[PDB]
Design a protein around this ligand. Structure first.
Ligand SMILES: CC(=O)N[C@@H]1[C@@H](O)[C@H](O)[C@@H](CO)O[C@H]1O
Ligand SMILES: *[C@@H]1O[C@H](CO)[C@@H](O)[C@H](O)[C@H]1NC(C)=O
Ligand SMILES: *[C@@H]1O[C@H](CO)[C@@H](O)[C@H](O)[C@H]1NC(C)=O
Ligand SMILES: *[C@@H]1O[C@H](CO)[C@@H](O)[C@H](O)[C@H]1NC(C)=O
Ligand SMILES: *[C@@H]1O[C@H](CO)[C@@H](O)[C@H](O)[C@H]1NC(C)=O
Lengths: 591, 194
C-alpha cells in the first residue's frame, strides 16, 4: 500500500534478480581470468554489458521510490545505494565525451614509454622496466631521467584531458546533488543512522586532518632518519635539512619507501626473518599454505572453508599452457561460491598474502546472510584493512614457531625487531602523508580552490610542506605530475589507503586486548583465541547493514578513527628514532 | 496385493518445478516403507505426525506423493508452521499434518555446468496459499494502486522466476529434490499397506 511497502517489494524483486545476474557476470569473468582466450574475453564482455544494462535500468526505477518516505534505515541504505545514478545522471552526449576522455587517459598510461637519452634506441616502458629501475637503481642521474621522462611525456599529454575531466565530473556530481566531484567521493563515508551514530561527508576532512596531526611526529622522525641514511648514498645531492628529491624514494611517485630498506636498514648484520627456506625444506605445497591459513581462522572461531572453496579455485599457476593473470584476488560469486585466485609460490610472502586473500573470503562468507545490496564491507577501508590484520598476526615469530617454520629455540632481539618494525614503517608510514596530501590536492582542485594555472605550484607547495619532497626539476603549469599516478589518471579515489591503514591497527588492538595479550602490540598473535574471533565476527556479519561507525564501535569500542593504536604499534621504533636523531635536525625547510 | 510405485516417483528422471508441484495418488498398494528409510541416501527425512518405523505394518486409505525441485537453502520450509518464500507462495503444509518430508541433493542430475534455468518459483502472490493449494497463474502481479494491463512496469512485476542451478554453487544454493507423503485414514476402504 504505502510508498515504503511498495519499496520493500521492489527491492525483493531486485536482490533476487540482481543476485542471479551477478553470479553470471562473475562466473564469466572467472573463466576469463583463469582461462584467457579471445572467446572467453568475448563472453566476459557480453555478460558485462548485460549486467551494466540491468543495473542502469533498475537504478532509474529505484529513484521512483523517494528516499524521504522510507522510515527503515536498513532499507533506506539499500535504496540510497541503488539510487545514485552517477554517470547516468549526466546528459547523454557529455557521457560519451567523458568516456572517450577516460579511455584515452588509461590507454596513454598503459602505452606510456619514455626513451633513455643516452641510448634512445633502447627506449623503455613503465610497468615492465621503469618500476624496476626506480626500485633498484642507485645512480642519481639515471633515476632522474626516468622520473622526469615519465612526467614529461605523460604529464604534459594528460594535462588537457584531466581538466575537461574535472569539468565533466564536477558537473556530474552537481547533477547528483553533490557540490563537487570530491564531495561525491566523500559520499562513501556518509552514514546516517541511529542518532549520534551518523556520519556527515564533511567530517571526513576534519577527521583525516586531525588524525594526521597526531601522526606527523612519527613521520618527521622517520623522515629525518631516512634522509640521514640517504645522505650517505647521495652525498652531493641531499640537504641535511631539506626535503628529499622525489625520484630517490624507491618508486616512481615516492608512494612507498619500502625499496629504501636496503639503504636504511638500521642493523644490517642481523638479517630479517625469512622462513621461505624453512618452508622449502619441509617440502610445503601451495595447498599446505592455504590449509595452514584455514586452520588459523578456525582456531579463532571462524568457519572452515567451504568445499566449494576447497573444490573450485585456482591456487597455483595452471602450467598446462593457458594464460592467466598472476595477481592474487578473493572472489565472491554471489551464491555461496567463494574462491581465491593466486599464482602461489613457496615464499613467506605468499604465505602471508594467502592469509589475507583468505581474510577477504572470510569477510565475504561472514556477511552473506545479508541482502544483496548490503553484502560488502562497512566502507572502502574495512575490506583490505580486515585482510591485512591476518597477515599481521601470521607474521609474528610467536606464530611462526607455533606452526613449525621457526625452530623452537628462537632469538627475538631488539636489533632484528627494529629492523622489522622499520621495514614496516617504510611501507606503512611512508604512504600516510603521500596519500593524504594527494587526496587533498584532488579535493581542493574539485572545490575549485586551486585555479588552473597554479596547479603544479600548489601541488608541489603541498609536497614540500606535507610530504617533504623536493620536485627536482622545476615544473610549471604546463606539467601535470599527479596524472602520472595510475589511481589519479584511471579515476580512482585514494583516501582509502589512509583510512584503511588507520583502521587495521584499531582492530588489531581491540582483538589483542581481547585475546588477553601481554606486551608490545607488534608481537600479538590472536591464534587459538575464540573470544577475539567471536568479537570480530559480530562486526564481520553486518556488511553494510549498519553505519560503519557502529560496525567499528562494536570491535574497538570507539566510533571514529584513532591513531593511538597505530602510534602504539610503532612506539618501539618511535622512541628509537627520536633518540637516534637528537644530534640532527628534525623537520624540513620548504626551500 | 501389488506394490506401490514409490519407485517410479522417487527415481523419476524429471521433476516438476515447485510452483506446479507434481502430485501422485497411491492406492491398491503394498509397499515397504522401511526400504526408503533403510536407504539413507536422503539428506532430509523427517516424517511428522507418525514415526516412520511404525507405519510399515499399518495400512492406509489414501497416500499422496508430491514431488518437486527446490533450492537446498529452502528445504527447511517444507514443514508445518514454516513461512518462507516457498511455503508462503509455493507449497504450504498445514499444522495438523501427518506425513513425511523426504529430500536429497540432486546436483549431479538437475544442475548444469553453465546453467540449468529450467526450474521456476513464484515470488509474488496476493495472499498466502492455503495448505496444499497449487497456483500456476502467470498473471502479472500488481502491487501498485495503478493497474497494469499486461505490461510489467514499476509496481507491477511478473510473478515467477528461474532458479538457475549451477554445479559450483554452495549447498544452500544447490538443487535438492523433494517428495512429501500425505496419509488420509478418513475414508472407509483403506488400500495402502506393508
Ligand atoms: C526497525 C525495523 O523496521 N527493522 C526491520 C526488521 O524488524 C525486519 O526483520 C527486517 C526485514 O523486513 O527489516 C527491518
Ligand atoms: C579454455 O577455453 C577454451 C575456449 O575459450 C575452452 O575450449 C577450453 O576447454 C578451456 N580450457 C580449460 C582448461 O578451461
Ligand atoms: C569443518 O569441521 C567440522 C567439524 O569437524 C566438520 O563437520 C565440517 O564438515 C568441516 N567442513 C567441511 C567443509 O567439511
Ligand atoms: C594452539 O594450540 C595448539 C594445541 O595446544 C598448539 O599446538 C599451537 O601451537 C597453539 N598455537 C598458538 C599460537 O599458541
Ligand atoms: C531407485 O534406484 C536405486 C538403484 O536402482 C534403488 O537401489 C532404489 O531402491 C530405488 N528406489 C526406489 C524407491 O525404488
Amino acid at each position: 500500500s504505502t510508498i515504503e511497502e511498495l519499496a520493500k517489494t521492489f527491492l525483493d524483486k531486485f536482490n533476487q534478480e540482481a543476485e542471479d545476474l551477478d553470479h553470471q557476470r562473475s562466473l564469466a569473468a572467472w573463466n576469463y581470468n583463469t582461462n584467457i582466450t579471445k572467446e572467453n574475453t568475448e563472453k566476459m564482455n557480453e555478460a558485462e554489458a548485460k549486467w551494466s544494462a540491468f543495473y542502469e535500468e533498475q537504478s532509474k526505477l529505484a529513484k521512483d521510490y523517494p528516499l524521504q518516505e522510507i522510515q527503515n534505515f536498513t532499507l533506506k541504505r539499500q535504496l540510497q545505494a541503488l539510487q545514485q545514478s552517477g554517470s547516468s545522471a549526466l546528459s547523454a552526449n557529455k557521457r560519451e565525451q567523458l568516456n572517450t576522455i577516460l579511455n584515452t587517459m588509461s590507454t596513454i598510461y598503459s602505452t606510456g614509454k619514455v626513451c633513455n637519452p643516452k641510448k634512445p634506441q633502447e627506449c623503455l616502458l613503465l610497468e615492465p622496466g621503469l618500476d624496476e629501475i626506480m626500485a633498484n637503481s642507485t645512480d642519481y642521474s639515471e633515476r632522474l631521467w626516468v622520473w622526469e621522462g615519465w612526467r614529461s611525456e605523460v604529464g604534459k599529454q594528460l594535462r588537457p584531458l584531466y581538466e575537461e575531466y574535472v569539468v565533466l565530473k564536477n558537473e556530474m556530481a552537481r547533477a547528483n546533488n553533490y557540490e563537487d566531484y570530491g564531495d561525491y567521493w566523500r559520499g562513501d563515508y556518509e552514514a546516517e543512522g541511529a542518532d549520534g551514530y551518523g556520519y556527515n561527508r564533511n567530517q571526513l576532512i576534519e577527521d583525516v586532518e586531525r588524525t594526521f596531526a597526531e601522526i606527523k611526529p612519527l613521520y618527521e622522525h622517520l623522515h629525518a632518519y631516512v634522509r640521514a641514511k640517504l645522505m650517505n648514498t647521495y652525498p652531493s645531492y641531499i640537504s641535511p635539512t631539506g626535503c628529499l628529491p622525489a625520484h630517490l624514494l624507491g618508486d616512481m611517485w615516492g608512494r612507498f619507501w619500502t625499496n629504501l630498506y636496503s639503504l636504511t636498514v638500521p642493523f644490517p648484520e642481523k638479517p630479517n626473518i625469512d622462513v621461505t627456506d624453512a618452508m622449502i625444506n619441509q617440502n610445503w605445497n601451495a595447498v599446505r599454505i592455504f590449509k595452514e591459513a584455514e586452520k588459523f581462522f578456525v582456531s579463532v572461531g571462524l568457519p572452515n572453508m567451504t568445499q566449494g572453496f576447497w573444490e573450485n579455485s585456482m591456487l597455483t599457476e595452471p602450467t598446462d599452457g593457458r594464460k592467466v593473470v598472476c595477481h592474487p584476488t578473493a572472489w565472491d560469486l554471489q551464491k555461496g561460491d567463494f574462491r581465491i585466485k593466486m599464482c602461489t609460490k613457496v615464499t613467506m610472502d605468499n604465505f602471508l598474502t594467502a592469509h589475507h586473500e583468505m581474510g577477504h573470503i572470510q569477510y565475504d562468507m561472514a556477511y552473506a546472510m545479508q541482502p544483496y545490496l548490503l553484502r560488502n564491507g562497512a566502507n572502502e577501508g574495512f575490506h583490505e584493512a580486515v585482510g591485512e590484520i591476518m597477515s599481521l598476526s601470521a607474521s609474528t615469530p610467536k606464530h611462526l614457531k607455533s606452526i613449525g617454520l621457526l625452530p623452537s629455540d628462537f632469538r627475538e632481539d631488539n636489533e632484528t625487531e627494529i629492523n622489522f618494525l622499520l621495514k614496516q614503517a617504510l611501507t606503512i608510514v611512508g604512504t600516510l602523508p603521500f596519500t593524504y596530501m594527494l587526496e587533498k590536492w584532488r579535493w581542493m582542485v574539485f572545490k575549485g580552490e586551486i585555479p588552473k594555472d597554479q596547479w603544479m605550484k600548489k601541488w608541489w607547495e603541498m609536497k614540500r610542506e606535507i610530504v617533504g619532497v623536493m620536485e627536482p626539476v622545476p615544473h610549471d603549469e604546463t606539467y601535470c605530475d599527479p596524472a602520472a599516478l595510475y589511481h589519479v589518471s584511471n579515476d580512482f579515489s585514494f583516501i582509502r589507503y589512509y583510512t584503511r591503514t588507520i583502521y587495521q591497527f584499531q582492530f588489531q588492538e581491540a582483538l589483542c586486548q581481547a585475546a588477553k595479550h601481554e606486551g608490545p602490540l607488534h608481537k600479538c598473535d590472536i591464534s587459538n583465541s575464540t573470544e577475539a574471533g567471536q568479537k570480530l565476527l559480530n562486526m564481520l556479519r553486518l556488511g553494510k547493514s549498519k553505519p560503519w561507525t557502529l560496525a567499528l564501535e562494536n570491535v574497538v569500542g570507539a566510533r571514529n578513527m584513532d591513531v593511538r593504536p597505530l602510534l602504539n604499534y610503532f612506539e618501539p621504533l618511535f622512541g628509537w628514532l627520536k633518540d637516534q636523531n637528537r644530534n640532527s635536525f628534525v623537520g624540513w625547510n620548504t626551500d | 496385493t501389488n506394490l506401490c510405485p514409490f519407485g517410479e516417483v522417487f527415481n523419476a528422471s524429471k521433476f516438476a518445478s515447485v510452483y506446479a508441484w507434481n502430485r501422485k495418488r497411491i492406492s491398491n498398494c503394498v509397499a515397504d516403507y522401511s526400504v526408503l528409510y533403510n536407504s539413507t541416501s536422503f539428506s532430509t527425512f523427517k516424517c511428522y505426525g507418525v514415526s516412520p518405523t511404525k507405519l510399515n505394518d499399518l495400512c492406509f486409505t489414501n497416500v499422496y506423493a508430491d514431488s518437486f525441485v527446490v533450492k537446498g537453502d529452502e528445504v527447511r520450509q517444507i514443514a508445518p508452521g514454516q513461512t518462507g518464500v516457498i511455503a508462503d507462495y509455493n507449497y504450504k503444509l498445514p499444522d495438523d499434518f501427518t506425513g513425511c518430508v523426504i529430500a536429497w541433493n540432486s546436483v549431479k542430475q538437475d544442475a548444469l555446468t553453465g546453467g540449468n534455468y529450467g526450474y521456476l518459483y513464484r515470488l509474488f502472490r496476493k495472499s498466502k496459499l492455503k495448505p496444499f493449494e497449487r497456483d500456476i497463474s502467470t498473471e502479472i502481479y500488481q502491487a501498485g494502486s495503478t493497474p497494469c494491463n499486461g505490461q510489467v512496469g514499476l509496481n507491477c512485476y511478473y510473478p515467477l522466476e528461474r532458479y538457475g542451478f549451477h554445479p559450483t554453487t554452495g549447498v544452500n544454493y544447490q538443487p535438492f529434490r523433494v517428495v512429501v507423503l500425505s496419509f488420509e485414514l478418513l475414508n472407509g476402504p483403506a488400500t495402502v499397506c506393508g
